[PDB]
Design a protein around this nucleic acid. Structure first.
Ligand SMILES: C[C@H](CCC(=O)NCCC[N+](C)(C)C[C@H](O)CS(=O)(=O)O)[C@H]1CC[C@H]2[C@@H]3[C@H](O)C[C@@H]4C[C@H](O)CC[C@]4(C)[C@H]3C[C@H](O)[C@]12C
Ligand SMILES: Nc1ncnc2c1ncn2[C@@H]1O[C@H](COP(=O)(O)OP(=O)(O)O)[C@@H](O)[C@H]1O
Ligand SMILES: [Mg+2]
Ligand SMILES: [Zn+2]
Ligand SMILES: [Zn+2]
Ligand SMILES: [Zn+2]
Lengths: 75, 185, 396, 590, 186
RNA sequence: UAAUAGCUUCUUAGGAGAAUGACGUAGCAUGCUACGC
RNA sequence: GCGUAGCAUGCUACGUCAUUCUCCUAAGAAGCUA
């Protein structure tokens, strides 16, 4: 299960972004929604992984939103 | 069942069992049958209120558990979702996702959405020469498991800095962090 | 008096297989109250009738699906099953057909209402439902037409529209046939009198209306749920052009709905032992239950797994809080155990095993939060397949 | 309503009713606490009183869980079972509660009245959760001590500018100053309702108080006052975030030729960048709060929040930042009431500015890249937990010195508190040592520093100035008028007034005295800016007149006197009382 | 139950029965007192049934009364809210223009769709892209509904202010479309 | 912000009915015994 | 043979309680469909 692991990770990622009030910036939320919906409607795993990279770059670009070091040290 | 009314009913039942083991005749036998019935009825009323009380106990237990768990789960919704997201990210073990996450830990985060179209623009902040040495080889920039052509390096003063000025000796006087704009190759 | 009414447009937050947004129409209480008081007697009378064309109020449990499918196959001669699709059904429906449905529903008021009362009720229906003011994001727009999906009589008026389109397709199929090629002398005279009653008669001929209704019931048996329809038509008549086909529905929807009905969404089933291909999003399979063969509806396993995996609330993710949530899903997913594909049959067992795990960890957490187990626990019957097998048995 | 046990962080649903803060306690820990101390009330989701028609039993070993509620010994349903038994107290999560051995320090923390001195040295060397609980209950006790202050009333009003006061007979009288407020009553028949928020201050002549009010209601003689109460909020964050030593600077960036004045502290700036939190300890006037601004000039892009426990110290820091930092990107955050007059020269009350200065109590929840706490001596563990909770940060810097005066600690009245128990930061400074240490006085002249390197610091400080011979030590008896419950020394003020017209260059020297009463009443007779010793800390002035009001253990405190004298910049005249204190310093003749 | 004297009759009958049993009364008197106790307890439980019905119907009546009072004190609130909304909407009306267009009506009746279009003093234009903006309301003044409007404000989809110099062909990608322009009737 | 309608599962409460058992009272039928005629 | 009284057995009516079942309504949680 790798195609279906990507489609659920994108759901969780967009839930995190919505919790981080990315929804307030309409231009960014439109791109996040487009990437999420195109990951869900995907047949190829490489396209889904590229769109997952693009969608995770939204989370990684906001410095003050999440603590990457603390989150990645719990693993 | 370790209750008083059951003690009364049980001793009446034992007395009737002994009597019917004897069971000669007849009025004592019928009176003991009636005594057994009248004790059993009170024991049964006590058992019925016992069961009503324990049913309400189970109602209270279930309701309180539902309330406590619901409020606990609704309280911790951000941190739980973020931990779940990073657990799922680690489980995928994609090389591009791991690369961008490891760079984000060092502080080499992007400034915009990483683009998918060829010859598209990526702006990424590099906070020290360590993150520059691994990622940038010559004019090439390795990021997100992809190769990019470095176009424009600026500082926090927005001053253009040539790729020749990034070195072990001149950069310790520069205005770090650099911001590198590159194009997807 | 005519009361205009504003209807809100509400985005729908639900699980779906396509990424297009779905919107419902929240109609005002001033319209819903009066429409209930006007239509609810007939609407409850439709929902309480078993064995009719409009299957509303008929459950699919306890043999209700088998009964529906046996009523569709009502002594047709060369049965083929057929199902079509209405593209943009609620938004491309003409105002004339919505007014037709509202007037058909209002034919029951021949004693309680006067003529003016019925006209003003129709006018209120049109002003509040058909061509209204729409609140969409803090702004009032004008709705050009088409049914709104939030009025009191939505599914029933939709059923009237569906039946009307099917009858129109049959009329066009019978009239567009040659007439010199029709071998059956009864159908040739039926076509002649159909043309007479259409374009040479202005008063209703109730005898011929009954005759054509009998013809349609005999050769074009229908099953309608508001936009889903299963037909058990005579294949020989439809091949000879005496009864509507898929192409007739395509033509009728082209010139009377302003849509193109592609034949990729319309199915035909030549074998009745497989049942309808899809009705109300349920496939049908013929199983041996007890000692006799019955028709059971099974859903898409993707739908049930998606309902289990994705929820619309954060507290539906706990599992132990929502065991009835999975009991209902296992009730819906039970007929998959009779599917010949084992991966389909494993969904029901997956749900049963998850119910058992949920109860195990619920009892563990409860015993942790206290030091005593619950005295009365009747949850053991939810991971036994008999509780779900009895859900599709005709005894109730 | 569940929670976490204080001393073991297990799951629980019990609380101690008798404790002021009502802390969560697991089953084992709650049994250990109640079976040994005098606390015998336990609150579950429902309280553990006896549910008879009328019965009042709270002791937990007397009770049983009978039927469906908690019942006493002779009210129980005939079916038991005991609550406080089997080494535990019956509550939720009963079979997951791991106890501890800290139910010997928690008994002392809960029981103690914070009167002795050992209570503080046990409230600051315990475990991390007890460090928070002890601070919480200490603040609660300090608040509930105000409930024992005598109810006031009005005698009459000859002058509407100066109220007449009358305390209730048989109760102590609270001190009259700005820190304490009052709210009234009119209980005659006829309105037992508040009549406004007032405040008091004594008058020089007779018995009078020149009051102040939030409204303009008059008091018909029955109207009176009671001191209100400040409820104390709970606290969660640790006193000190655990330290991590980075290999290299993360989250901060150096600068290009920071300045020619801050070029000496560069190594300490890099050390600050390397570590998670740093401590700077130095004698007063050596460059501690001028280190923080230099740090700001060294990390220009870093958003910085400056904080302190006092107002007159953060005001001096604000003035220094205005002198050095760009004034456009500053702020100043003030409380809603703003009891003291704060600093109004920047864009006041804008939290999202780059450099933001605020008191600890008025800190808003925000983030930063380095937070600079200043004068940690004034701060208790409550202030440290508050600043660690509200302000998230990447780097923490605590600057301050233990030899200055500590927090008030009004409840403490027996023994003396050593520096190493002022709070966790001072304990860290004295135990292992500061991370940065700079001893060289750059502010005060040679004479005053050469005397203060004999009082408090054991001959450590060299310094840099020349003794201008404007350091004066006066001999004056100074008769006592214990007026406002803080002493007033009228003849010493008379000495000052009679020799402040003989000093043409001393017309602007700030007046410093340990007692707020004389310090406030001096404003009429000499007109100089006035300042108490406790709030003078952290601020420098070009000239200081210090007056030892009365001989006590408060005014003859070496820490207080050392933090008083070392605010001078070129000269200081001080009049003394103790024959020893005047002799330990070496000043001019008079 | 205990208030009614049926409990008193049961208690005195039981006391007499116990006293006579302890006193060794004869079998006939014992049966007589047993029968009297039985009928006393019968009356006691029979009236306790009426007491059960009394308390049950009293609680039902009290709950019904509470519900009715709540639904009558929630009706006045919504009545006042509807009245305030209607009167504020009255006060919003452009009375002079509406009076003109309604006096021009022959029957006094006008279509609703022309009420804003001829009397509204403020126009909100929602524009999805730059070509539409250039077409409909380029410049600080434009024409719509046979009237002249002057741009008073422009905001984006984020409700942030946008200046008319920022709405360009090259700055279009940097704007959060759609743009909502608010203009006033000139 | 969250529409109309249908079906189903689960839980709680109230009423009514049915069945079984228990007790008490009243009425009727029968057997035995004591007294009077 | 009759009347009165007592005991035992049986049937009916009424009242109370215990258990099980059915239904009618109300309230709440949830699932699916159009
Ligand atoms: C009698 C019953 C179980 C039977 C038993 O015999 N237990 C004996 C104890 C278990 N052993 C075996 C460890 C000993 C006991 C055990 C746990 C008790 C509940 C919770 O605490 C608290 C809860 C919240 C409020 O307070 C109101 C009451 C609640 C519902 C309590 C009700 C009742 O009182 C419970 C069910
Ligand atoms: N590098 C320096 N060169 C010259 N003077 C300095 C230097 N550093 C500090 N000072 C002077 O020393 C004084 C120290 O002030 P401050 O840091 O507030 O002391 P403290 O922190 O003890 O209150 C400042 O007023 C400043 O004028
Ligand atoms: Mg300082
Ligand atoms: Zn305690
Ligand atoms: Zn504990
Ligand atoms: Zn008691």
């Amino acid at each position: 299960s790798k195609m279906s692991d990507v489609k659920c990770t994108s759901v969780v990622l967009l839930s995190v972004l919505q919790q981080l009030r990315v929804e307030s910036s309409s231009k960014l939320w439109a791109q996040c929604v487009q990437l999420h919906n195109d990951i869900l409607l995907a047949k190829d795993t490489t396209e889904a992984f590229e769109k997952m990279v693009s969608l995770l770059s939204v989370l990684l670009s906001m410095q003050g939103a999440v603590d990457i070091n603390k989150l990645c040290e719990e693993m | 069942s370790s209750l008083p009314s059951y003690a009364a009913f049980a001793t009446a039942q034992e007395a009737y069992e002994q009597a019917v083991a004897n069971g000669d005749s007849e009025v004592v036998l019928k009176k003991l049958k009636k005594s057994l019935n009248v004790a059993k009825s009170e024991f049964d009323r006590d058992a019925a209120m016992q069961r009503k009380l324990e049913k309400m106990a189970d109602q209270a237990m279930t309701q309180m558990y539902k309330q406590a768990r619901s409020e606990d789960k609704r309280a911790k919704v951000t941190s739980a979702m973020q931990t779940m997201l990073f657990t799922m990210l680690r489980k995928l073990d994609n090389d591009a996702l791991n690369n961008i996450i490891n760079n984000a830990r060092d502080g080499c985060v992007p400034l915009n959405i990483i683009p998918l179209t060829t010859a598209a623009k990526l702006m990424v902040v590099i906070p020290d020469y360590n993150t520059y040495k691994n990622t940038c080889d010559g004019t090439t920039f390795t990021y997100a498991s992809a190769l990019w052509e470095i176009q424009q390096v600026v500082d926090a003063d927005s001053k253009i800095v040539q790729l020749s000025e990034i070195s072990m000796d001149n950069s310790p006087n520069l205005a770090w962090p650099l911001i590198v704009t590159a194009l997807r190759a | 008096n005519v009361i205009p009414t504003i209807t809100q447009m509400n985005l729908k937050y639900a699980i779906s297989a396509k990424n297009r947004a779905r919107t419902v129409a929240g109609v005002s209480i001033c319209s819903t109250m009066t429409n209930r008081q006007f239509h609810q007697k007939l609407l409850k009378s439709i929902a309480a009738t078993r064995g009719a064309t409009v299957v509303i109020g008929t459950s699919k449990f306890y043999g209700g699906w088998h009964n529906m499918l046996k009523t569709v196959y009502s002594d047709v001669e060369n049965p083929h099953l057929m199902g079509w699709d209405y593209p943009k059904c609620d938004r491309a429906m003409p105002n004339m057909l919505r007014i037709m449905a509202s007037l058909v529903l209002a034919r029951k008021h021949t004693t309680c209402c006067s003529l003016s009362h019925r006209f003003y009720r129709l006018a209120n229906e049109c002003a509040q439902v058909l061509s209204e003011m729409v609140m969409c994001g803090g702004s009032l727009y004008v709705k050009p037409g088409g049914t709104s999906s939030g009025d009191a009589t939505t599914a029933y008026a939709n059923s009237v529209f569906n039946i009307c389109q099917a009858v129109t397709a049959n009329v066009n199929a019978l009239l567009s046939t040659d007439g010199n090629k029709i071998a059956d002398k009864y159908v040739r005279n039926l076509q002649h009198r159909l043309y007479e009653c259409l374009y040479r008669n202005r008063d209703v001929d109730t005898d011929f209306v009954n005759e054509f209704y009998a013809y349609l019931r005999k050769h074009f048996s229908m099953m309608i749920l508001s936009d889903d329809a299963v037909v058990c038509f005579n294949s020989t008549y439809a091949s000879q052009g005496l009864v509507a086909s898929i192409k007739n529905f395509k033509s009728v929807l082209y010139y009377q709905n302003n849509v193109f009905m592609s034949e990729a969404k319309c199915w035909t089933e030549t074998d009745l032992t497989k049942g309808p291909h899809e009705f109300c999003s349920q496939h049908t399979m013929l199983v041996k239950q007890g000692d006799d063969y019955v028709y059971l509806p099974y859903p898409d396993p993707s739908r049930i797994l998606g309902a289990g995996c994705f929820v619309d609330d954060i507290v539906k993710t706990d599992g132990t809080l929502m065991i009835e949530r999975f009991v209902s899903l296992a009730i819906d997913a039970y007929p998959l155990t009779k599917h010949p594909n084992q991966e389909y049959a494993d969904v029901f067992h997956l749900y049963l095993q998850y119910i058992r795990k949920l109860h195990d960890e619920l009892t563990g957490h409860m015993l942790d939060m206290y030091s005593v187990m619950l005295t009365n626990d009747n949850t053991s019957r939810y991971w036994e397949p008999e509780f779900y097998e009895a859900m599709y048995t005709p005894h109730t | 309503a569940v929670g976490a046990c204080v001393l073991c962080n297990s799951q629980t649903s019990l609380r101690c009713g008798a404790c002021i803060r009502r802390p969560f306690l697991c089953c084992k820990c709650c049994y250990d606490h109640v079976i040994s101390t005098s606390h015998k009330l336990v609150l579950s989701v429902n309280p553990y009183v006896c549910n008879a028609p009328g019965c009042d039993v709270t002791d937990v070993t007397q009770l049983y869980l009978g039927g469906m509620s908690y019942y006493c010994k002779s009210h129980k349903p005939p079916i038991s079972f005991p609550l406080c038994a089997n080494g535990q107290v019956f509550g939720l999560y009963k079979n997951t509660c791991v106890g501890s051995d800290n139910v010997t320090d928690f008994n002392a923390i809960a029981t103690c009245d914070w009167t002795n001195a050992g209570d503080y040295i046990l409230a600051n060397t315990c475990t991390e959760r007890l460090k928070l609980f002890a601070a919480e209950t200490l603040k609660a006790t300090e608040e509930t001590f105000k409930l024992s202050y005598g109810i006031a009333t009005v005698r009459e009003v000859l002058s509407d500018r100066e109220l007449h006061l009358s305390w209730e007979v048989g109760k102590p009288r609270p001190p009259l100053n700005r820190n304490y407020v009052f709210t009234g009553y009119r209980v005659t028949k006829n309105s037992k309702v508040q009549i406004g928020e007032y405040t008091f201050e004594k008058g020089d002549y007779g018995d009078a108080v020149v009051y102040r009010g939030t409204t303009t209601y008059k008091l018909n003689v029955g109207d009176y006052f009671v001191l209100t109460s400040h409820t104390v909020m709970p606290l969660s964050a640790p006193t000190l975030v655990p330290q991590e030593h980075y290999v290299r600077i993360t989250g901060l960036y150096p600068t290009l030729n920071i300045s020619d004045e801050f070029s000496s502290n560069v190594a300490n700036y890099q050390k600050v960048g390397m570590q998670k939190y740093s401590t700077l300890q130095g004698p007063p006037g050596t460059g501690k709060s001028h280190f923080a601004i230099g740090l700001a000039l060294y990390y220009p892009s870093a958003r910085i929040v400056y904080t302190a426990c006092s107002h007159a110290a953060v005001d001096a820091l604000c003035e220094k930042a205005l002198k050095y930092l760009p004034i456009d990107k500053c702020s100043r955050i003030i409380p809603a009431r703003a009891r003291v007059e704060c600093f109004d020269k920047f864009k006041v009350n804008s939290t999202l500015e780059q450099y933001v200065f605020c008191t600890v109590n008025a800190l808003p929840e925000t983030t930063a890249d380095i937070v600079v706490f200043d004068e940690i001596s004034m701060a208790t563990n409550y202030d440290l937990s508050v600043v660690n909770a509200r302000l998230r940060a990447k780097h923490y810097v605590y600057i301050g010195d233990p030899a200055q005066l500590p927090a008030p600690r009004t409840l403490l009245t027996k023994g003396t508190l050593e520096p190493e128990y002022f709070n966790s930061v001072c304990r860290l400074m004295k135990t292992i040592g500061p991370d940065m240490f700079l001893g060289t006085c750059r502010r005060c002249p040679a004479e005053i520093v050469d005397t203060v390197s004999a009082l408090v610091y054991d001959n450590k400080l060299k310094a840099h100035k020349d003794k201008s011979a404007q350091c004066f030590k006066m001999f004056y008896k100074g008769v006592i008028t214990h007026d406002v419950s803080s002493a007033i020394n009228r003849p010493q003020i008379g000495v000052v007034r009679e020799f402040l017209t003989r000093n043409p260059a001393w017309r602007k020297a700030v007046f410093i005295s340990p007692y707020n009463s004389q310090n406030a009443v001096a404003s009429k007779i000499l007109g100089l800016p006035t300042q108490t010793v406790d709030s003078s800390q952290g601020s420098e002035y070009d000239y200081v007149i210090f007056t030892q009001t009365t001989e006590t253990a408060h005014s003859c405190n070496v820490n207080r006197f050392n933090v008083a004298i070392t605010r001078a910049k070129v000269g200081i005249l001080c009049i003394m009382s103790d024959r020893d204190l005047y002799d330990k310093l070496q000043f001019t003749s008079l």
